[PDB]
From a paper:
We therefore determined the complex crystal structures of EGFR T790M/CO-1686 and EGFR L858R/CO-1686. The binding modes of CO-1686 to EGFR T790M and L858R are essentially the same and EGFR mutant proteins adopt the “DFG-in/C-helix in” active conformation. As expected, CO-1686 covalently binds to EGFR through Cys797 in both structures. In the T790M/CO-1686 and L858R/CO-1686 complex crystal structures, the anilinopyrimidine core of CO-1686 form two hydrogen bonds with Met793 amide and carbonyl in the hinge of the kinase. In the structure of T790M/CO-1686, the trifluoromethyl (−CF3) substituent attached to the pyrimidine ring contacts the mutant gatekeeper residue Met790 by hydrophobic interaction, which may be the only difference between the T790M/CO-1686 and L858R/CO-1686 structures. The hydrophobicity afforded by the T790M gatekeeper mutation is beneficial to the potency of this drug towards EGFR. In the T790M/CO-1686 complex structure, the anilinopyrimidine scaffold of CO-1686 fits well to the methionine gatekeeper. The hydrophobic interaction between the trifluoromethyl moiety and the Met790 side-chain enhances the affinity of CO-1686 towards T790M. Probably because the trifluoromethyl substituent on the pyrimidine ring contacting the mutant gatekeeper residue Met790 is much bulkier than the chlorine substituent in WZ4002, the CO-1686 core scaffold is “pushed out” a bit compared to WZ4002, and the distance of the bidentate hydrogen bonds between the anilinopyrimidine core and the ‘hinge’ residue Met793 are closer in the T790M/CO-1686 structure than those observed in the T790M/WZ4002 structure. What’s more, the C-helix in T790M/CO-1686 structure rotates about 20° inwards when compared with the T790M/WZ4002 complex.
Numbering used by the authors: 696 to 748, 750 to 990, 1006 to 1018
The structure:
């Protein structure tokens, strides 16, 4: 029942790209801002380069798994892997997203973020997630931190590090114990290590909550061990001040105990899209009207660089 995965994995010469400056640091890897020039193509492509420290064979296995997933996705609302460089250190080359992660963007820019941007971001994430479902991909780590901003107008889902691809036959994926973001997790996943597209939907609800609260941490001041019981009791994240009941009810649905009664991503696209048509009706934000948000000769965005 499973179709062949015919995605190309592109191997890139080290010489083809130059790191310009560091973006983020981890012992495991450091992401770099960079320029990519395909050999003799006359284009420059802004990129983010993730290269691992001097690191374990296991570390190299995980990075390759990430590369496999990223190579296999092509959607406007998903980040895609441009290629990999097989140096002494393995490097993932990705499209640069100039405005960084969405979680940082909302926190930084709250005073200038209108209802239209929020509702639109919600539609875009739903579109990306729906695409992943079409691809039978369960992301397993959806969060504001894992959404990137190409422009304030355009966002893409990222971080396929925990991402798992379902067999056509099998709905659910059962996970060996590993470090997890409980606060974004569905209850069934927390209790049983069970992940589904519907479980992704619970995560989406939390992500929406994060955007509506302009980057607040969910269940702040509460230990992860506690969270499972709290949900069991029936506690849920509080309605955000900007949110109307219409928006909030959607989040609540995402957090329902019965996974099937939760909304489909395709539905989420429809509902948010209607709201986006008249944003002030569904999100109440002070001063909504006033706010506005944002050799290079041969530079081309990755989205415009095809094969
Ligand atoms: C939610 C935090 C987060 O994801 N941070 C982060 C940091 C570094 C790389 C990535 N991944 C990434 N980023 C970008 N584009 C991008 C990200 C961050 C920044 N910053 C971060 C803060 N800065 C400083 C100096 O502290 C500068 C601006 C800038 C930037 O582009 C300019 N593009 C792609 C990735 C990818 F994920 F690796 F692909 C995330």
């Amino acid at each position: 029942g499973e179709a062949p995965n015919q995605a190309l994995l592109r191997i890139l010469k080290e010489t083809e790209f130059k790191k310009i400056k560091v973006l983020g640091s981890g012992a495991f890897g450091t992401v770099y801002k960079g320029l990519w020039i395909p050999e003799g193509e006359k284009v420059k492509i802004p990129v983010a380069i993730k290269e691992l420290r001097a690191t374990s064979p296991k570390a190299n296995k995980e990075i390759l798994d990430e590369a496999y997933v990223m190579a296999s996705v092509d959607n406007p609302h998903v980040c895609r892997l441009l290629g990999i460089c097989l140096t002494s250190t393995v490097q993932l080359i990705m499209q640069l997203m100039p405005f960084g992660c969405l979680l940082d963007y909302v926190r930084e820019h709250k005073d200038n973020i209108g209802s239209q941007y929020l509702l639109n971001w919600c539609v875009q994430i739903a579109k990306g997630m729906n695409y992943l479902e079409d691809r039978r991909l369960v992301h397993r780590d959806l969060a504001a931190r894992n959404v990137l901003v190409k422009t304030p107008q355009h966002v893409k889902i990222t971080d396929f590090g925990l991402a798992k691809l379902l067999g056509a036959e099998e709905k659910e994926y059962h996970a060996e114990g590993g470090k997890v973001p409980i606060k974004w997790m569905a209850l069934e996943s927390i209790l049983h290590r069970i992940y589904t597209h519907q479980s992704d939907v619970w995560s989406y609800g939390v992500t929406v909550w994060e955007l509506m609260t302009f980057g607040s941490k969910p269940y702040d001041g509460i230990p992860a061990s506690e969270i499972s019981s709290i949900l069991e009791k029936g506690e849920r994240l509080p309605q955000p001040p900007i949110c109307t009941i219409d928006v909030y009810m959607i989040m609540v649905k995402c957090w329902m105990i019965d996974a099937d009664s939760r909304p489909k991503f395709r539905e989420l696209i429809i509902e948010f899209s209607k709201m986006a048509r008249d944003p002030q009706r569904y999100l109440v934000i002070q001063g909504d009207e006033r706010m506005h948000l944002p050799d290079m000769d041969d530079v081309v965005d990755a989205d415009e660089y095809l094969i």
